[PDB]
Amino acid sequence: KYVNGSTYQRWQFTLPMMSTLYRLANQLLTDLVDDNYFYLFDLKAFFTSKALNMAIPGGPKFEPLVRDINLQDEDWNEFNDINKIIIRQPIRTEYKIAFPYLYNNLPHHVHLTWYHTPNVVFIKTEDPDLPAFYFDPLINPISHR
Amino acid sequence: FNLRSGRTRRALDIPLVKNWYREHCPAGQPVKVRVSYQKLLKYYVLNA
Amino acid sequence: KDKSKELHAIKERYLRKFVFEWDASEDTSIDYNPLYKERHQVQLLGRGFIAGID
Amino acid sequence: MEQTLPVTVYEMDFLADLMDNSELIRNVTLCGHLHHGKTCFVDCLIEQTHPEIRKRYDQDLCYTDILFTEQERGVGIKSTPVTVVLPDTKGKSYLFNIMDTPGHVNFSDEVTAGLRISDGVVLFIDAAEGVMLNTERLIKHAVQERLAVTVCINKIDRLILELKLPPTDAYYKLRHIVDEVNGLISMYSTDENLILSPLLGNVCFSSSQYSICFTLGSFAKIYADTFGDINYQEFAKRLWGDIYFNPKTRKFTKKAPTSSSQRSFVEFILEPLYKILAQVVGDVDTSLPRTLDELGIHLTKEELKLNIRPLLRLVCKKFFGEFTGFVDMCVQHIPSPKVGAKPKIEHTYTGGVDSDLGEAMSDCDPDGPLMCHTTKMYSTDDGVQFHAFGRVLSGTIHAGQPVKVLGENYTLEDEEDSQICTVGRLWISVARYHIEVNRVPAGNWVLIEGVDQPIVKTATITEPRGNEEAQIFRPLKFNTTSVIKIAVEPVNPSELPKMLDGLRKVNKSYPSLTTKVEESGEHVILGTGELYLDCVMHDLRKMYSEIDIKVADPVVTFCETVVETSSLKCFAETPNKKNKITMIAEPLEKGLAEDIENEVVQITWNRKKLGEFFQTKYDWDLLAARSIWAFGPDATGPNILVDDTLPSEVDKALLGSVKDSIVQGFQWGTREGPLCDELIRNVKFKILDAVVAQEPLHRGGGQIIPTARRVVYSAFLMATPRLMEPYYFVEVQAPADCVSAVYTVLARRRGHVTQDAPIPGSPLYTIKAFIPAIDSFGFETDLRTHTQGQAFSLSVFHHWQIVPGDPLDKSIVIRPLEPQPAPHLAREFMIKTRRRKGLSEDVSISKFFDDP
Amino acid sequence: RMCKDLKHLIYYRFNTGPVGKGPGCGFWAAGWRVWLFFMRGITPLLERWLGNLLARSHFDLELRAAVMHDILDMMPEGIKQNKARTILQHLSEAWRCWKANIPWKVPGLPTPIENMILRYVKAKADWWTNTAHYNRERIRRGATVDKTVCKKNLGRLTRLYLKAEQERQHNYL
Amino acid sequence: RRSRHCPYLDTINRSVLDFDFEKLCSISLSHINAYACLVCGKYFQGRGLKSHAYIHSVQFSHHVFLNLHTLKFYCLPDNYEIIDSSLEDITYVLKPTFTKQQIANLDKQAKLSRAYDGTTYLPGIVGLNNIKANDYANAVLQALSNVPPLRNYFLEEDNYKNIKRPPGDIMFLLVQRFGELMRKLWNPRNFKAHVSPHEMLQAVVLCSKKTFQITKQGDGVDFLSWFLNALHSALGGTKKKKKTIVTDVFQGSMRIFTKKLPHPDLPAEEKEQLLHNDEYQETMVESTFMYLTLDLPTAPLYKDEKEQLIIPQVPLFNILAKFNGITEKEYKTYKENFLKRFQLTKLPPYLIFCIKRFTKNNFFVEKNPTIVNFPITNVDLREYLSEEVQAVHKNTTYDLIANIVHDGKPSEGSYRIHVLHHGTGKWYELQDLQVTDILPQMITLSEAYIQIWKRR
Amino acid sequence: PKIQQQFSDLKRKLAEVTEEEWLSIPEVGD
Ligand SMILES: O=P(O)(O)O[C@H]1[C@H](OP(=O)(O)O)[C@@H](OP(=O)(O)O)[C@H](OP(=O)(O)O)[C@@H](OP(=O)(O)O)[C@H]1OP(=O)(O)O
Ligand SMILES: Nc1nc2c(ncn2[C@@H]2O[C@H](COP(=O)(O)OP(=O)(O)OP(=O)(O)O)[C@@H](O)[C@H]2O)c(=O)[nH]1
Ligand SMILES: [Mg+2]
Ligand SMILES: [Zn+2]
C-alpha cells in the first residue's frame, strides 16, 4: 500500500502520514512558505554574482569569470565622465545582481534572477483545537461596509 | 513534504542541511561559521 | 569606517601548507549599509521557526 | 490554412469564420496588478482550447510570457495576444482576442498598447492581496480609455488554502474587493451605470492555479446540469449579496432566517468550493472518492495518485469544466466590437466619429475602407523583422496587398509620414503559434508583415488610392511618464551601427521607450523603472544588437519650473531687429498643470468654454482667460502661453499673423528649457507686448520661432527657476512586522511614507510612500534584501516636486563623486545634467537677452 | 574543509538553547555524504591502479633523431659505420647553411636524401623561428631566464633579424 | 512659389556633405523621413513642425534641407521645396544615377573628373577609407569595381532591386550596399575623391556574422570567396537562381580528375592489384570555380647561384601548370592521398587567380614571398583547355585588370591594389586612400595575392 | 602529426635511391 515493493523504489503515502512526518521533521525545516526569502540569494543570483566577479554579502566569492575592466585603466571618455554622474546611493553589488543588464557593462554568462513570487500568506495553525478554516488574528479584520 | 507520492532516494542523495546554508546565515554568528556558510554556498553553486 | 567604505565603494565603482580552516579574509557580509548588516530576520507570522535552532 | 497548428478543441476554419462575424468577437485586455493571475488564466484558457497543450504538474506553463526574459524573470514584460474560440455557458462559441498584458507597473505602457486595440478589460485581482497599485492604475486607465471594465477575482484558493478564512469572512473579503473596485470606478468615472457586481456578471471569481472559474451564472449552471428543473439565470440573480436561503420555504430572502444562516454565496457557492478544496487537500485518501462521487466527478486510479496541487487542478477542471463564466462576463459586459466601434472611434481616432471615415469605422464593416490600427510591434526571434500588431477597424487587410501606413506625425496637411508598404503575410496571433491567414476582416486583431519599416510606435494602416481624407488614430497616451534615463554606448565604438539598429528595434518593442541622442552624442533611453530598463537593456544587448554595450548610471529626467514671476519683463528682437516679443513667466496655479496634462482642459475647445473654465476654476479674468494661445510643449503640456498685449498697443491682426510662430517657439522652448534642456513645467508665459513687422517676409518663421524661444528662456530665467524631481509613488506590500523595516529603508532614500494600512483580510500591510525617482535606484532591492524578501515594492511615477536646492547657485561647490545634501541637490542636478547634455558649465539668466 | 564547514553549520544550530559547547553533537549524515561522494570519484582510480598492479622545448633534438632514424632505417645495412656520421654532418651543415642565408647544394648528395634534409631544415627552421620569437616574448615580458637562454636567443634573433634585413635590402633592390 | 528664389542657398557648403553613411536622424535614430541639413551635413528626421529638421533649422539658423529619400530640397523652418539646378550635384553625390549611355561610355573616360574640392580623380579609381583594419576588403571591393559587367550591374539599382528576398533576409544588404558603393566609386561628380566603404562594411560584418570585421583584418581571398558567394546567394530570388551576375562574370567550370593513390605502405603485388579495384582509378567531379587558386612552390629555403636576390620567383605559366590535364597535385587527408588533376572547361570572362601566399606550418603562418612573373596584357590560356573545349572558346587571351597585393608579415600586413583604368591604359596603385600611378612593369614585381583578368 | 608521420613520404621516396649512390655521399669537408 505504501511502497513499490521489495526494491524500495516508489512510495505513496497517506496525508496523515505525510503530516506527522512533516511534524517530526520540523526541526530540520525553516518553515518558509516562499522562495522570496532567497531574493538575491538563490542559485541564479549566485551564478550572476560569479559571472560579474561580485560577491553577494551572505554569499560565495569566486575567481573572476572574465578578466575585469580595470577602472584606473579606462581613460575618462565622455561616457564615464564622473562629473556627469549624479550619486545618490552607492550602486551596490545587489543592484547589479538584481538588474544585471541595467547596472553592468558587459553582463556575460549572467542569469536573470526570478523576480517576486507573490507572498504566500499562509497562516500556520498553532492550535489544532481551532477550526481549519478560521479567521486567525494574524489576518487583518475586514471592516464591514 | 508537499508530495504524497515520490520516488525513493539514496541516503547519500538526501542532504539534511542543504537548505540550511542556502538560508542566510543567522544573526550573531562568529566569523568561521559565516565563512563556512559562504563556502558551502560556493561549492553548492560550483556543483550546480 | 562604514562611511569610508561607502565612499570607497563609490570611488571604485567609478574611479605547500595544508590549511584546514577558512580564513576570515575569505569572508563576505562585511557591509557598511545598516540595511544590509542588520537585515530584519523573518518573523514567519510569529509561528514559523528557523531550522535546527532550538 | 496551409500551416501546422496544434491540436485544438475548435478548428481553425471555425476561427477564421468567427473572424468574419464581428458580433462574435471579443477584443479583451486581461490586465491587472503584477502576479495577479492573468498569464495563468490565459494558460487555463489555452489548456481548455488545446487538448495537447498541458501545464506541468509542479511548474505552471505560462504559454504567454514567450520571451526569455519573461521566462527567467517570471514577470510578464510584453503583452501577448491570444486568439482562442471560447464556448459560453449556453454553449455558444465566441472568438476571443485576449491581450495578456504585463501587470508590472513599469510595463504599464504595454497595457496601453493592449487597451487601445481592446473593447473591454478584465481586471484581475488577487483575492488575497486585493486591490493593489496597478489595479487602481488600470481601473483609471481602463475607464479613461472608454473601455468596458469587468473583474476577475483570481486566486480565490488563497482565501481557502493560504489564509484559511471562514467562508463568510472570505465572502466579506471578495465583497470588500468588489466594493473597492466599485469605489475606484465611481472615482474615475461620473457614470454609475458601470457598477461592477457579480450579480450583474461583471465580477468573475477564479483560481487559475487550480482552473476554477465561475461567475454566478456559470456556478448556477453546475446546479442546473446537476439538478434539472432549475433555471440558472434567476438563481444567479440570487446567489450574491446579503441574500439568504430559506430551505423550509425554499425561497431566497433578504431577511436572514435562523440568526446564523449564511448568505446564498456562502451556502451555495463558497462552502461547496471550500469543501471541494478541503476534501482534496486534507482528505484525499480517506474521503475524496465519496465526495467526488457526490460531485459527479470520477477520476482514474492514475489520476488520484497525483500530488495535491495537480489533483486540485484536475478536480476543479472536472467540476467547473470550461471557463464559460469568463465568456459569460466578457460577452454580456464587453462590446461587440460592432457596438464598441463607436466609443473606440470617438476616443482614439483624430477625426472623431463625425468624419466621413469615422462613420464608416463606427460601422466596423469588413467591406469598408481599410482602417487598421497597430499599437504593438512584435519582433521575430531572429531580431531582424518586426510585425505590426493591431486591430482592423474597417475593411480587410489582405496578404500581398499594398497598403498605406501612416505614422504618428501624419496629419492631413503633412502627408509625408505615410508610406506605401506591401503587406507580406497576415497572422492571427496566438501566443506560441501563429495562424497564417489570407485576409483579416474588421474587428479582428492581426500580425502584419512588411509594414514594420515606416513606423516606430503606432500606425494607422489605410489603403492607397482611396481614403485620401484618412487620418491617424491618436498615439498611445500612456499611463505614466518614461522618466528613468540611461546613457548607452557600445563597448567597441566600431559596432555603434548595430547598437543604433538595436536602439531602433527597442524603440519598436517598448511603446513608451524614448531613444534619443543628446547634443554630446550621448544615446539616451527613457524608461519607467529599473526592471523596465533592465529588460530594455537585455533586449538591446541580446535580442537586437548582439554587441556589448556600456550603460551609464540610471538618472532621471528633470523638469524645470518657476516659483515667482519674472523680475524684469523680458524681451527679444529678431535678427532683423524688428519683431520684439516681451514676455514674463509666472508659476501656474496649483492643480492647473494636472488639469492641462489630464485633459481637463484642451486648446481644441472653443475660446468660450476654455475661458469659462479658467474663470470659474482658477480666478482668472476673462481678459486673461480668453487670451490663451497654447498649452506647453505639446497640445497637453503643463505650461500656458497667454498674451496680455492690449489691442491699444498692439495690432491684434498683426499679432495673430505671428501667433503660430510665437506658439511654435514657446512650445520648443518649453520642450527644451534653458536650465538643463529638459521640459519646462507649470509656468505661465504671458506675452506682455509684441512689436510685429508689417510685411510678412520680415516676420515669421526663421526670425520669430528662435526669438520666441529666446524670450521664453529669458522670461523663465528671470523668474526664479527651480528644478523638478520626479517622485515615484511606492506601494509596498510587506508583512505586519516588516512595516518598521520599510520605514527604515525609505528613510535612507528621502522617501516620505504616505500611509501604512492593513490589507483587509490578509496578514499583510501596504506602505504607500513617495520616494524621489533619483533615489529609487535599487530601492526595491534595498527593501527586499533588508526585509529578507518579505516586503515587496512597486514604484510608479506620480508627480514632479521641486528639488530642495536652487539650481542657479554658483556659491555651491560640488565635489564630483559625492552624494550631495538636500539644500543644494538642484545645483548638483542642474549642472551634471548640463554636463550630460554637454551644454555650458552654467546657465546665466542673461544668456538669451539682447543686452548681453 | 567542506566537512569542517558542515560541522560549523551543524554545531552552531545544534549548540543553541540549553545545549552549550561540548562533544555531544552527532549529526553525521552531512560529512558521511561528503566522504561517500569522494569515494564515488576515486573508486575507478584505485580500481584502475589495482587493475594495472594485479595484472598478468627540445623539438630540434627529437626532430634530428627522427630524421636520422628515418634515413638510418632505409640504408643498405652494410653501411652504417660509414655514412651515419656523414649524413648527420650533412644535416648539421644544411642547418648551418640555412642559419647563414648561404646556398646549400651538395652535388654528390642524392636528391631523396637531399629532399629529406631540406624537409628537416624547414621543420627546424619553423621551430627555430617560433622558439626564438617565443623565447623573446618570454624574455621581453620579464620571465626569468638564465644566461645561455638569452645568449642563444640573441643569436637566433640576430640571424632572424638579418634574414629579415637581407629580405628588406633585396626588396629595395 | 518662393521656390527658384530661395535666399538660403548660399548657406550650403558641400565641404560637409558626407552622404556615405547611415541615413538616420542624428537625434531620433529614425530612417523615416531623414533630411540632410546642407549647412552642416547632419541628418535630422522630418520636415514638419516639431520634427528634428525643423527644430534644427530654427536652432542653428540652418535653413536648407534635402530629403535623403525623395531627393527634394526644402527650406525649413518655413517650408517650401527648393527647385534649383545648381543643387543637382548634391543629389547626384547623395544618389548617383547612371544612364545606359553613361554606363556604356563609362570605360571610355580618359579625362580626369574633378571633385568639389580641387582634387582630380578618375571614376572607379577612387580611394576607399581605412577604418581600423580594413584594407583586405577595400582591396577586394576595388577589385570588383573595375570589373566592367559586375560594375554595370551594380550601377543600375533596377538590375537588382525588384528581385525577391526572404522576409528576414539580411544578406541582400550586401547587394544593395555594394550597389551603393559602386555608384559612389564611379560617381564622376563626387564631392571628394574618396568614398568611405563603412556602410558596405557594416553590411559585411552583419552578413558574415562578425567574420570579416573592420577592427580585425581578414584575408582577401577569404573575403573575396565569401563575398562573391554571398553576392551570388543574395542575387538569387528566394532560391538558387543558377545564373546571377557573379556567375556570369567570374564563374568558370573546371574538371577535377581525382585519383586515389592505393596506400604507400603496401607491397608491389598488392599495390598493382589495387588498380583494378576502381576505387583507385580516375574520377570526374567537374565543378564550378569563382576563382582559381594558384599554389606557389615554396620559398626555396636557400639562395642560389643565378639571380642574386633572396626573393624567389615563378612564371605565371608554371603555377598555371596546375589546370592543365597533365600536372597532378598531391592531396593528403587522413588515411588517403589523392592525385588531383585539373582541367579548365568553361573559362569565365573575368578570371580571378587567388594566389595562395599564407600557409600555416607546424608553428605559425608563413607568407610565401615568391614573386609571380606574369605578363599583364596577354595570357593565352588556350592550352589549359581540352581540345573538346578549345573550339567553343574563341577568345582565351586575358589581360590583367586588377592585382591585389598583400605587403608585409601575415600578422602586420597591408593590402594595396593595382587597378587598370580602362580608357586610359594607366595603372593605379590604390592603397586605401592614396592613389599612386604605378607603372605597368612594376605590377609583376609585387606579391600578387588576388588577380582579376579580362578575356577581351 | 608526429615527426616521422611528416617524414614518411620522404622516407618512402628515400627507399627509391640505389646503392651506387649511398657510399658516393660526400662529407662536409668541402
Ligand atoms: O572550528 P574548528 O577550528 O574546527 O574547531 C572546533 C571548535 O573549536 P574552536 O571554537 O576553539 O575553534 C568548536 O567550538 P565552537 O565552534 O563551538 O566554538 C568545537 O566544538 P565544541 O566546542 O562545541 O565541542 C570543536 O570540537 P569538536 O569538533 O571535536 O566537537 C572544534 O573542533 P576540534 O576538535 O578540531 O578542536
Ligand atoms: N495561490 C494561487 N497562485 C496563483 C494562482 N494563479 C497564479 N498563481 C501563481 O501566481 C504567480 C502569478 O504569475 P502569473 O499569473 O503567470 O503572472 P501574471 O498574473 O500574469 O502577472 P505578470 O507577472 O505581470 O505577467 C504564478 O507563479 C502562479 O504560480 C492562483 O489562482 N492561486
Ligand atoms: Mg502576464
Ligand atoms: Zn545644420
Of D687, D694, D795, give the one whose Cα is nearest residue D749: D795
The full 3-state SS of F416-454, as one line of letters, equals EEEEECCCCCCEEEEECCEEEEECCCCHHHCCEEEEEEE
Phi-psi region of D561 (alpha: psi -120 to 50; beta: other; left: phi over 0): beta
Of D661, D720, D748, D728, give the one whose Cα is nearest residue D696: D661
Task: For ligand 1, say whether the CB of E24 is within 6 Å of any of its atoms.
Answer: no
User: CA-based diameter of chain A, in Å?
Assistant: 74
User: How far from A123 is each of A116, C48, D755, D760, F139, CA to CA, in Å?
Assistant: 20, 9, 25, 15, 75
Of D19, D40, D23, D36, give the one whose Cα is nearest residue D83: D19
Of F442, F428, F426, give the one whose Cα is nearest residue F185: F428
Of A111, C25, A35, give the one whose Cα is nearest residue B38: C25
Task: For ligand 1, say whether the CB of C19 is within 6 Å of any of its atoms.
Answer: no
Strands F113-114 and F344-346: unpaired
Alpha helices (H) in D244-302, listed in sequence order: 264-265, 271-281, 284-294
C-alpha cell at D584: 514674463
CB F38 within 8 A of CB F90: yes
A 10 A CB-CB count for D231 gives 9
The vertex-D781 CA angle with D779 and D782, nearest 5°, equals 65
Using DSSP, state whether F82 is helix, strand or coil. Answer: strand
Of D664, D645, D665, give the one whose Cα is nearest residue D655: D645
Question: Which residue in this structure is represented by grid cell 576595388?
Answer: F142
Given D745, D782, D788, which is nearest C42 (Cβ)? D788
CB D111 within 8 A of CB D77: no
Question: Which residue in this structure is represented by grid cell 581613460?
Answer: A75
Task: For ligand 1, say whether the CB of E1 is within 6 Å of any of its atoms.
Answer: no
In ligand 2, which atom is closest to the CA atom of D62? 16
Q: What's phi and psi for F120, nearest 5 deg?
A: -75, 150
DSSP D438: S
Of D590, D352, D357, give the one whose Cα is nearest residue D470: D357
Using DSSP, state whether F167 is helix, strand or coil. Answer: coil
CB A123 within 8 A of CB A138: yes
Angstrom distance (rounded) from CA D315 to CA D302 = 13
Q: After which residues is chain B broken (C to N over 2.5 A)?
A: none
D40-53 burial by CB neighbour count: b if 16+ within 10 A, else e?
bbbbbbbbbbbeeb
Angstrom distance (rounded) from CA D429 to CA D81 = 6
Angstrom distance (rounded) from CA F102 to CA F155 = 10
Using DSSP, state whether D667 is helix, strand or coil. Answer: helix
The identity of residue D298, as a single letter, is: H
Chain E with chain G: Cβ pairs closer than 8 A: 72
Q: What's phi and psi for D315, nearest 5 deg?
A: -65, -40
Task: For ligand 1, say whether the CB of E17 is within 6 Å of any of its atoms.
Answer: no
Tell me whether residue D337 is annotated as binding: no
A43-51 vs B31-47: helix crossing angle, rounded to 10 = 90
Angstrom distance (rounded) from CA F133 to CA F220 = 12
**H helix or E strand, kind and range, residue D614:** helix D607-618
Angstrom distance (rounded) from CA F344 to CA F386 = 7
Alpha helices (H) in D121-231, listed in sequence order: 133-144, 157, 167-187, 216-226
CA distance C3 to chain E (A): 32
The identity of residue F353, as a single letter, is: F
Angstrom distance (rounded) from CA D522 to CA D486 = 10
> Which residues have C-beta within 8 Å of that of residue C29, sequence separation ≥ 6?
A57, A58, B25, B34, B38, C37
> Do D307 and B24 lie within an 8 Å CB cutoff?
no
User: How far from E135 is each of D239, E153, E156, E161, CA to CA, in Å?
Assistant: 91, 7, 10, 15
What is the torsional sign of CA F150, F152, F155, F161? Answer: negative
Task: For ligand 2, say whether the CB of D33 is within 6 Å of any of its atoms.
Answer: no
Ligand 4 centre from F62 Cα, in Å?
Answer: 5
C-alpha cell at F400: 590583367
What is the torsional sign of CA F54, F58, F63, F68? Answer: negative
CB D93 within 8 A of CB D87: yes
Angstrom distance (rounded) from CA A33 to CA B28 = 24
Ligand 1 centre from C18 Cα, in Å?
Answer: 18
Residue nearest to atom 35 of ligand 1 (CA): E4
CB D154 within 8 A of CB D207: yes
Residue nearest to atom 18 of ligand 1 (CA): E21
A 10 A CB-CB count for D413 gives 6
- What Rg value do the Cα atoms of chain D yield, rounded? 29
User: CA-based diameter of chain B, in Å?
Assistant: 41
> Which residues have C-beta within 8 Å of that of residue F106, sequence separation ≥ 6?
F98, F123, F148, F151, F152, F155, F186
Task: For ligand 2, say whether the CB of D388 is within 6 Å of any of its atoms.
Answer: no
- Compute, in degrees rounded to 10, the torsion defined by CA atoms D503, D506, D512, D515: 0
Of A145, C46, A116, give the one whose Cα is nearest residue D760: A145
Q: Which chains touch F (3 or more CB pairs under 8 A)?
A: D, E, G
Smallest CA–CA distance from F266 into chain G, residue: G12
> Which residues have C-beta within 8 Å of that of residue D637, sequence separation ≥ 6?
D596, D597, D631, D667, D670, D679
Query: What experimental approach yielded this model?
Result: cryo-EM
The identity of residue D214, as a single letter, is: F
The identity of residue D40, as a single letter, is: C
C-alpha cell at D446: 492581426
> Which residues have C-beta within 8 Å of that of residue E154, sequence separation ≥ 6?
none
**H helix or E strand, kind and range, residue D770:** strand D764-772
C-alpha cell at F336: 588517403
The distance in angstroms from the start CA to the end CA of chain A is 52
Angstrom distance (rounded) from CA F300 to CA F320 = 19
- DSSP sequence for D676-696: TSS-B-SEEEEEEEE---SST
Tell me whether residue F40 is annotated as binding: yes
Ligand 1 centre from E15 Cα, in Å?
Answer: 11
C-alpha cell at E120: 628537416
Task: For ligand 2, say whether the CB of D173 is within 6 Å of any of its atoms.
Answer: no
User: How far from D671 is each of D634, D679, D797, D827, CA to CA, in Å?
Assistant: 8, 5, 19, 21
Angstrom distance (rounded) from CA D219 to CA D237 = 12
CB D264 within 8 A of CB D249: no
Q: Which chains touch G (3 or more CB pairs under 8 A)?
A: E, F
Angstrom distance (rounded) from CA D365 to CA D191 = 29
Of D445, D108, D665, D102, give the one whose Cα is nearest residue F57: D665
Question: Which residue in this structure is represented by grid cell 660509414?
Answer: E82
Of D843, D771, D800, give the one whose Cα is nearest residue D637: D800
D739-747 vs D779-786: helix crossing angle, rounded to 10 = 140
Q: Which chains touch A (3 or more CB pairs under 8 A)?
A: B, C, D
Which of F11, F27, F32, F173 is the best mutation test for D, with the most CBs of D within 10 A? F32
**H helix or E strand, kind and range, residue F200:** helix F198-207
Angstrom distance (rounded) from CA A18 to CA A13 = 7
Angstrom distance (rounded) from CA B31 to CA E8 = 10
What is the torsional sign of CA D91, D97, D102, D103? Answer: negative
Angstrom distance (rounded) from CA E42 to CA E48 = 10
Burial class of residue E137, CB neighbours in 10 A (0-12, 13-18, 19+): exposed
Q: Does A47 reach chain D within 8 Å, measured CB to CB?
A: no
Tell me whether residue D33 is annotated as binding: yes
Smallest CA–CA distance from A42 into chain B, residue: B22
* Mutate-to-test residue for ligand 2 from D33, D35, D154, highest number of ligand atoms within 8 A of CB: D35
* Mutate-to-test residue for ligand 1 from E1, E5, E7, E27, highest number of ligand atoms within 8 A of CB: E7
Burial class of residue D691, CB neighbours in 10 A (0-12, 13-18, 19+): middle
Instruction: Give the distance from CA F426 to its chain's centroid.
Output: 20
Phi-psi region of C4 (alpha: psi -120 to 50; beta: other; left: phi over 0): alpha
Angstrom distance (rounded) from CA F207 to CA F233 = 12
Which one of the ligands is nearest to E16 CA? Answer: 1
CA distance D515 to chain F (A): 6
Burial class of residue D110, CB neighbours in 10 A (0-12, 13-18, 19+): buried
Task: For ligand 2, say whether the CB of A137 is within 6 Å of any of its atoms.
Answer: no
Given D738, D748, D817, which is nearest C40 (Cβ)? D738
Q: Which long-range contacts (CB under 8 A, 24 or more apart) does D313-320 make?
A: D313/D55, D313/D209, D313/D210, D313/D211, D315/D276, D315/D280, D316/D207, D316/D210, D316/D211, D316/D212, D316/D276, D317/D211, D319/D222, D319/D276, D319/D295, D320/D211, D320/D212, D320/D213, D320/D214, D320/D218, D320/D222
CB F297 within 8 A of CB F356: no
Smallest CA–CA distance from D310 into chain B, residue: B3
* Mutate-to-test residue for ligand 1 from C18, C21, C22, C23, highest number of ligand atoms within 8 A of CB: C21
A 10 A CB-CB count for D767 gives 26
CB D737 within 8 A of CB D764: no
Burial class of residue D443, CB neighbours in 10 A (0-12, 13-18, 19+): buried
CB D716 within 8 A of CB D683: yes
User: CA-based diameter of chain E, in Å?
Assistant: 100
The partner residues of A75 in beta bridges, in order of sequence, read: none
The identity of residue F151, as a single letter, is: R
CB F286 within 8 A of CB F345: yes
The partner residues of F360 in beta bridges, in order of sequence, read: F365
Using a CB-CB distance cutoff of 8 angstroms, which residues of chain F are in contact with residue E166? 310
Q: Which long-range contacts (CB under 8 A, 24 or more apart) does F116-122 make?
A: F116/F14, F116/F15, F116/F89, F116/F190, F116/F191, F116/F192, F117/F15, F117/F191, F117/F192, F117/F193, F119/F192, F119/F193, F120/F193, F121/F190, F121/F193, F121/F435, F122/F421, F122/F424, F122/F428
Angstrom distance (rounded) from CA D235 to CA D223 = 9
Ligand 2 centre from A101 Cα, in Å?
Answer: 25
User: How far from F14 is each of D248, F7, F60, F194, G12, CA to CA, in Å?
Assistant: 98, 17, 17, 14, 72
* Mutate-to-test residue for ligand 2 from D30, D33, D36, D39, highest number of ligand atoms within 8 A of CB: D39
Smallest CA–CA distance from A57 into chain C, residue: C29
Of D239, D232, D258, give the one whose Cα is nearest residue D247: D258
Tell me whether residue D665 is annotated as binding: no
Using a CB-CB distance cutoff of 8 angstroms, which residues of chain C are in contact with residue A90? 6, 9-10, 13
Instruction: Give the distance from CA D331 to its chain's centroid.
Output: 23
D510-543 burial by CB neighbour count: b if 16+ within 10 A, else e?
bbbbebbbbebebbbbbbbbbbbbbbbbbbbbbb
CB D515 within 8 A of CB D570: no
Angstrom distance (rounded) from CA A107 to CA A111 = 9
C-alpha cell at F356: 595562395
CB D770 within 8 A of CB D727: yes
CA distance E49 to chain G (A): 29
E111-141 vs E147-172: helix crossing angle, rounded to 10 = 110
Using a CB-CB distance cutoff of 8 angstroms, which residues of chain E are in contact with residue F364? 126, 129-130, 133
Burial class of residue D612, CB neighbours in 10 A (0-12, 13-18, 19+): middle
Residue nearest to atom 7 of ligand 1 (CA): E8
Q: Does B3 reach chain D within 8 Å, measured CB to CB?
A: yes
Burial class of residue D79, CB neighbours in 10 A (0-12, 13-18, 19+): buried
CA distance F401 to chain D (A): 33
Can you point out the beta strands (E) in F83-133?
113-114, 120-121, 127-128
CA distance G5 to chain E (A): 10
What is the torsional sign of CA F325, F326, F329, F335? Answer: positive
CB F302 within 8 A of CB E97: yes
Q: After which residues is chain E broken (C to N over 2.5 A)?
A: 56
Instruction: Give the distance from CA F67 to its chain's centroid.
Output: 30
Tell me whether residue F56 is annotated as binding: yes
A 10 A CB-CB count for E2 gives 18
CB F14 within 8 A of CB F64: no
Using a CB-CB distance cutoff of 8 angstroms, which residues of chain C are in contact with residue D551? none
Instruction: Give the distance from CA D591 to its chain's centroid.
Output: 23
The full 3-state SS of D74-94, as one line of letters, equals CCCCCCEEEEEEEECCCCCEE
Q: What's phi and psi for D495, nearest 5 deg?
A: -95, 30
Of F194, F177, F180, F198, give the one whose Cα is nearest residue F122: F194
Which one of the ligands is nearest to C19 CA? Answer: 1
Q: Does A111 reach chain D within 8 Å, measured CB to CB?
A: yes
> Do B31 and C24 lie within an 8 Å CB cutoff?
yes
Angstrom distance (rounded) from CA D748 to CA D59 = 38
Given B12, B16, B37, which is nearest E37 (Cβ)? B12
User: How far from A126 is each of A14, C29, C46, CA to CA, in Å?
Assistant: 22, 35, 10
Strands D721-735 and D764-772: antiparallel
The identity of residue D763, as a single letter, is: P
